[PDB]
mmCIF file of all heavy atoms in Angstrom:
data_model
loop_
_atom_site.group_PDB
_atom_site.id
_atom_site.type_symbol
_atom_site.label_atom_id
_atom_site.label_comp_id
_atom_site.label_asym_id
_atom_site.label_seq_id
_atom_site.Cartn_x
_atom_site.Cartn_y
_atom_site.Cartn_z
ATOM 1 N N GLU A 1 0.788 -1.233 0.000
ATOM 2 C CA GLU A 1 0.000 0.000 0.000
ATOM 3 C C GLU A 1 0.821 1.284 0.000
ATOM 4 O O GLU A 1 0.295 2.355 -0.306
ATOM 5 C CB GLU A 1 -0.996 -0.018 1.161
ATOM 6 C CG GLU A 1 -2.089 -1.062 0.952
ATOM 7 C CD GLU A 1 -1.648 -2.476 1.283
ATOM 8 O OE1 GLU A 1 -0.630 -2.636 1.994
ATOM 9 O OE2 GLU A 1 -2.318 -3.432 0.817
ATOM 10 N N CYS A 2 2.107 1.192 0.334
ATOM 11 C CA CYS A 2 2.965 2.381 0.309
ATOM 12 C C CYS A 2 3.120 2.902 -1.114
ATOM 13 O O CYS A 2 3.453 4.061 -1.314
ATOM 14 C CB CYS A 2 4.332 2.098 0.934
ATOM 15 S SG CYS A 2 4.253 1.616 2.662
ATOM 16 N N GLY A 3 2.880 2.044 -2.101
ATOM 17 C CA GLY A 3 2.866 2.484 -3.484
ATOM 18 C C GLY A 3 4.222 2.449 -4.159
ATOM 19 O O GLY A 3 4.396 2.994 -5.249
ATOM 20 N N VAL A 4 5.196 1.832 -3.503
ATOM 21 C CA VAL A 4 6.534 1.726 -4.063
ATOM 22 C C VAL A 4 6.729 0.325 -4.603
ATOM 23 O O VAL A 4 6.341 -0.637 -3.954
ATOM 24 C CB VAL A 4 7.589 2.000 -2.977
ATOM 25 C CG1 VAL A 4 8.993 2.012 -3.571
ATOM 26 C CG2 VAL A 4 7.295 3.325 -2.310
ATOM 27 N N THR A 5 7.293 0.220 -5.805
ATOM 28 C CA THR A 5 7.720 -1.074 -6.335
ATOM 29 C C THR A 5 9.247 -1.166 -6.220
ATOM 30 O O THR A 5 9.970 -0.263 -6.651
ATOM 31 C CB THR A 5 7.322 -1.252 -7.796
ATOM 32 O OG1 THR A 5 5.905 -1.090 -7.924
ATOM 33 C CG2 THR A 5 7.739 -2.634 -8.286
ATOM 34 N N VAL A 6 9.738 -2.243 -5.612
ATOM 35 C CA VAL A 6 11.174 -2.405 -5.405
ATOM 36 C C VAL A 6 11.673 -3.552 -6.248
ATOM 37 O O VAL A 6 11.333 -4.714 -6.013
ATOM 38 C CB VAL A 6 11.497 -2.666 -3.911
ATOM 39 C CG1 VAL A 6 13.011 -2.832 -3.665
ATOM 40 C CG2 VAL A 6 10.916 -1.576 -3.058
ATOM 41 N N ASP A 7 12.455 -3.212 -7.263
ATOM 42 C CA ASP A 7 13.116 -4.214 -8.074
ATOM 43 C C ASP A 7 14.582 -4.248 -7.696
ATOM 44 O O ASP A 7 15.028 -3.468 -6.848
ATOM 45 C CB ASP A 7 12.947 -3.886 -9.559
ATOM 46 C CG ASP A 7 11.536 -4.168 -10.074
ATOM 47 O OD1 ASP A 7 10.714 -4.714 -9.313
ATOM 48 O OD2 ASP A 7 11.244 -3.793 -11.233
ATOM 49 N N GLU A 8 15.335 -5.150 -8.312
ATOM 50 C CA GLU A 8 16.725 -5.347 -7.920
ATOM 51 C C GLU A 8 17.581 -4.082 -8.002
ATOM 52 O O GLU A 8 18.398 -3.809 -7.117
ATOM 53 C CB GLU A 8 17.360 -6.454 -8.754
ATOM 54 C CG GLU A 8 16.827 -7.849 -8.441
ATOM 55 C CD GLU A 8 17.571 -8.890 -9.224
ATOM 56 O OE1 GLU A 8 18.369 -8.494 -10.106
ATOM 57 O OE2 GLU A 8 17.364 -10.089 -8.958
ATOM 58 N N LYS A 9 17.412 -3.333 -9.086
ATOM 59 C CA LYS A 9 18.218 -2.139 -9.305
ATOM 60 C C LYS A 9 17.354 -0.899 -9.493
ATOM 61 O O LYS A 9 17.856 0.153 -9.878
ATOM 62 C CB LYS A 9 19.130 -2.329 -10.519
ATOM 63 C CG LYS A 9 20.245 -3.378 -10.364
ATOM 64 C CD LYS A 9 21.220 -2.956 -9.280
ATOM 65 C CE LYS A 9 22.588 -3.594 -9.478
ATOM 66 N NZ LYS A 9 23.470 -3.380 -8.279
ATOM 67 N N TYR A 10 16.063 -1.012 -9.194
ATOM 68 C CA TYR A 10 15.115 0.048 -9.542
ATOM 69 C C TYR A 10 14.038 0.171 -8.478
ATOM 70 O O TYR A 10 13.377 -0.801 -8.136
ATOM 71 C CB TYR A 10 14.490 -0.247 -10.916
ATOM 72 C CG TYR A 10 13.576 0.821 -11.507
ATOM 73 C CD1 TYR A 10 13.742 2.177 -11.222
ATOM 74 C CD2 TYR A 10 12.579 0.465 -12.407
ATOM 75 C CE1 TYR A 10 12.921 3.134 -11.797
ATOM 76 C CE2 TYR A 10 11.746 1.411 -12.976
ATOM 77 C CZ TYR A 10 11.925 2.741 -12.673
ATOM 78 O OH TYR A 10 11.089 3.656 -13.252
ATOM 79 N N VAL A 11 13.889 1.381 -7.948
ATOM 80 C CA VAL A 11 12.865 1.669 -6.966
ATOM 81 C C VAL A 11 11.964 2.697 -7.576
ATOM 82 O O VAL A 11 12.438 3.708 -8.089
ATOM 83 C CB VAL A 11 13.497 2.212 -5.665
ATOM 84 C CG1 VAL A 11 12.423 2.593 -4.645
ATOM 85 C CG2 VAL A 11 14.464 1.189 -5.108
ATOM 86 N N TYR A 12 10.662 2.436 -7.546
ATOM 87 C CA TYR A 12 9.746 3.306 -8.273
ATOM 88 C C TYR A 12 8.345 3.361 -7.695
ATOM 89 O O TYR A 12 7.940 2.441 -6.996
ATOM 90 C CB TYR A 12 9.762 2.976 -9.769
ATOM 91 C CG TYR A 12 9.281 1.616 -10.187
ATOM 92 C CD1 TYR A 12 7.994 1.426 -10.678
ATOM 93 C CD2 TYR A 12 10.150 0.529 -10.186
ATOM 94 C CE1 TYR A 12 7.574 0.164 -11.120
ATOM 95 C CE2 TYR A 12 9.735 -0.735 -10.629
ATOM 96 C CZ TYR A 12 8.448 -0.899 -11.087
ATOM 97 O OH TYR A 12 8.033 -2.137 -11.508
ATOM 98 N N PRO A 13 7.628 4.483 -7.923
ATOM 99 C CA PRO A 13 8.054 5.640 -8.713
ATOM 100 C C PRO A 13 8.644 6.745 -7.847
ATOM 101 O O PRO A 13 7.958 7.299 -6.987
ATOM 102 C CB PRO A 13 6.740 6.109 -9.345
ATOM 103 C CG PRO A 13 5.698 5.776 -8.303
ATOM 104 C CD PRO A 13 6.217 4.613 -7.493
ATOM 105 N N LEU A 14 9.918 7.051 -8.050
ATOM 106 C CA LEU A 14 10.531 8.114 -7.266
ATOM 107 C C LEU A 14 10.825 9.355 -8.106
ATOM 108 O O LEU A 14 11.291 9.257 -9.249
ATOM 109 C CB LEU A 14 11.818 7.627 -6.594
ATOM 110 C CG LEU A 14 11.713 6.451 -5.625
ATOM 111 C CD1 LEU A 14 13.079 6.172 -4.948
ATOM 112 C CD2 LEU A 14 10.654 6.771 -4.577
ATOM 113 N N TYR A 15 10.554 10.526 -7.528
ATOM 114 C CA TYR A 15 10.964 11.782 -8.149
ATOM 115 C C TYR A 15 12.333 12.146 -7.596
ATOM 116 O O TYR A 15 12.500 12.227 -6.382
ATOM 117 C CB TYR A 15 9.970 12.919 -7.861
ATOM 118 C CG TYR A 15 10.288 14.197 -8.631
ATOM 119 C CD1 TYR A 15 10.442 14.176 -10.009
ATOM 120 C CD2 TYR A 15 10.423 15.418 -7.977
ATOM 121 C CE1 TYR A 15 10.728 15.321 -10.713
ATOM 122 C CE2 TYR A 15 10.711 16.581 -8.684
ATOM 123 C CZ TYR A 15 10.859 16.519 -10.052
ATOM 124 O OH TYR A 15 11.143 17.652 -10.778
ATOM 125 N N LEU A 16 13.304 12.319 -8.495
ATOM 126 C CA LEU A 16 14.670 12.680 -8.115
ATOM 127 C C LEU A 16 15.289 11.722 -7.113
ATOM 128 O O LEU A 16 16.111 12.126 -6.302
ATOM 129 C CB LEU A 16 14.729 14.135 -7.585
ATOM 130 C CG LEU A 16 14.360 15.210 -8.606
ATOM 131 C CD1 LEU A 16 14.281 16.597 -7.964
ATOM 132 C CD2 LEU A 16 15.377 15.209 -9.740
ATOM 133 N N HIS A 17 14.925 10.441 -7.210
ATOM 134 C CA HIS A 17 15.431 9.400 -6.315
ATOM 135 C C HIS A 17 14.995 9.525 -4.859
ATOM 136 O O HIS A 17 15.515 8.806 -3.987
ATOM 137 C CB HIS A 17 16.970 9.322 -6.390
ATOM 138 C CG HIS A 17 17.505 9.239 -7.790
ATOM 139 N ND1 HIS A 17 17.274 8.152 -8.612
ATOM 140 C CD2 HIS A 17 18.305 10.077 -8.491
ATOM 141 C CE1 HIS A 17 17.882 8.342 -9.769
ATOM 142 N NE2 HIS A 17 18.517 9.502 -9.722
ATOM 143 N N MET A 18 14.009 10.381 -4.596
ATOM 144 C CA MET A 18 13.614 10.686 -3.228
ATOM 145 C C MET A 18 12.125 10.556 -2.936
ATOM 146 O O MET A 18 11.723 9.855 -2.011
ATOM 147 C CB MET A 18 14.082 12.100 -2.858
ATOM 148 C CG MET A 18 15.593 12.245 -2.807
ATOM 149 S SD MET A 18 16.102 13.921 -2.472
ATOM 150 C CE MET A 18 15.880 14.669 -4.075
ATOM 151 N N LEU A 19 11.308 11.247 -3.719
ATOM 152 C CA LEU A 19 9.904 11.403 -3.384
ATOM 153 C C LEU A 19 9.039 10.271 -3.958
ATOM 154 O O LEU A 19 9.080 10.016 -5.148
ATOM 155 C CB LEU A 19 9.391 12.744 -3.907
ATOM 156 C CG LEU A 19 7.886 12.954 -3.661
ATOM 157 C CD1 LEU A 19 7.659 13.417 -2.233
ATOM 158 C CD2 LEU A 19 7.274 13.915 -4.649
ATOM 159 N N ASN A 20 8.265 9.615 -3.103
ATOM 160 C CA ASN A 20 7.289 8.621 -3.542
ATOM 161 C C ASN A 20 6.146 9.355 -4.236
ATOM 162 O O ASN A 20 5.331 10.000 -3.577
ATOM 163 C CB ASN A 20 6.783 7.863 -2.306
ATOM 164 C CG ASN A 20 5.763 6.796 -2.626
ATOM 165 O OD1 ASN A 20 5.189 6.753 -3.714
ATOM 166 N ND2 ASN A 20 5.521 5.917 -1.657
ATOM 167 N N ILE A 21 6.133 9.323 -5.567
ATOM 168 C CA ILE A 21 5.117 10.026 -6.347
ATOM 169 C C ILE A 21 3.700 9.568 -5.956
ATOM 170 O O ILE A 21 2.790 10.384 -5.842
ATOM 171 C CB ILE A 21 5.383 9.897 -7.874
ATOM 172 C CG1 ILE A 21 6.778 10.448 -8.217
ATOM 173 C CG2 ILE A 21 4.302 10.605 -8.681
ATOM 174 C CD1 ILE A 21 7.177 10.297 -9.689
ATOM 175 N N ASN A 22 3.525 8.271 -5.703
ATOM 176 C CA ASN A 22 2.220 7.756 -5.278
ATOM 177 C C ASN A 22 1.801 8.232 -3.887
ATOM 178 O O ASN A 22 0.629 8.496 -3.638
ATOM 179 C CB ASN A 22 2.191 6.225 -5.318
ATOM 180 C CG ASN A 22 2.108 5.688 -6.721
ATOM 181 O OD1 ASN A 22 1.581 6.352 -7.607
ATOM 182 N ND2 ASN A 22 2.600 4.461 -6.931
ATOM 183 N N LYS A 23 2.761 8.338 -2.975
ATOM 184 C CA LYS A 23 2.460 8.773 -1.615
ATOM 185 C C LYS A 23 3.518 9.769 -1.201
ATOM 186 O O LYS A 23 4.511 9.395 -0.589
ATOM 187 C CB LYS A 23 2.440 7.594 -0.630
ATOM 188 C CG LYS A 23 1.494 6.461 -1.009
ATOM 189 C CD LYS A 23 0.042 6.885 -0.864
ATOM 190 C CE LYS A 23 -0.371 6.967 0.589
ATOM 191 N NZ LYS A 23 -1.835 7.254 0.724
ATOM 192 N N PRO A 24 3.321 11.043 -1.561
ATOM 193 C CA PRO A 24 4.406 12.030 -1.455
ATOM 194 C C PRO A 24 4.813 12.438 -0.040
ATOM 195 O O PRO A 24 5.677 13.297 0.099
ATOM 196 C CB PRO A 24 3.879 13.236 -2.256
ATOM 197 C CG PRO A 24 2.384 13.080 -2.258
ATOM 198 C CD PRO A 24 2.126 11.581 -2.237
ATOM 199 N N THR A 25 4.241 11.832 0.989
ATOM 200 C CA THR A 25 4.743 12.078 2.335
ATOM 201 C C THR A 25 5.692 10.974 2.772
ATOM 202 O O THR A 25 6.161 10.936 3.908
ATOM 203 C CB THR A 25 3.598 12.277 3.341
ATOM 204 O OG1 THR A 25 2.705 11.169 3.279
ATOM 205 C CG2 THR A 25 2.829 13.534 2.968
ATOM 206 N N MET A 26 5.972 10.070 1.847
ATOM 207 C CA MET A 26 7.078 9.149 2.033
ATOM 208 C C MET A 26 8.219 9.552 1.127
ATOM 209 O O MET A 26 8.028 9.767 -0.073
ATOM 210 C CB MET A 26 6.657 7.700 1.723
ATOM 211 C CG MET A 26 7.849 6.782 1.586
ATOM 212 S SD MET A 26 7.420 5.048 1.297
ATOM 213 C CE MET A 26 6.782 4.621 2.916
ATOM 214 N N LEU A 27 9.409 9.671 1.702
ATOM 215 C CA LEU A 27 10.571 9.989 0.886
ATOM 216 C C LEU A 27 11.748 9.097 1.243
ATOM 217 O O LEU A 27 11.816 8.545 2.338
ATOM 218 C CB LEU A 27 10.955 11.465 1.043
ATOM 219 C CG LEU A 27 9.873 12.489 0.677
ATOM 220 C CD1 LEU A 27 9.036 12.879 1.878
ATOM 221 C CD2 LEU A 27 10.483 13.688 0.011
ATOM 222 N N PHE A 28 12.688 8.981 0.317
ATOM 223 C CA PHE A 28 13.860 8.152 0.527
ATOM 224 C C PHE A 28 15.095 9.033 0.446
ATOM 225 O O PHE A 28 15.137 9.949 -0.358
ATOM 226 C CB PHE A 28 13.956 7.077 -0.567
ATOM 227 C CG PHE A 28 12.873 6.039 -0.518
ATOM 228 C CD1 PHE A 28 11.581 6.332 -0.937
ATOM 229 C CD2 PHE A 28 13.169 4.736 -0.115
ATOM 230 C CE1 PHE A 28 10.586 5.350 -0.921
ATOM 231 C CE2 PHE A 28 12.181 3.751 -0.101
ATOM 232 C CZ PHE A 28 10.890 4.058 -0.505
ATOM 233 N N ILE A 29 16.090 8.755 1.283
ATOM 234 C CA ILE A 29 17.414 9.348 1.120
ATOM 235 C C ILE A 29 18.431 8.234 0.931
ATOM 236 O O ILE A 29 18.394 7.248 1.661
ATOM 237 C CB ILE A 29 17.797 10.242 2.325
ATOM 238 C CG1 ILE A 29 16.817 11.418 2.414
ATOM 239 C CG2 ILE A 29 19.218 10.755 2.174
ATOM 240 C CD1 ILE A 29 16.971 12.314 3.630
#
């Protein structure tokens, strides 16, 4: 439900490698 798909070399959908486009109050550093 977080809306992130995690593949081996690809995490998506992220804006600028940080922002979860589906749930924009989740971010990655």
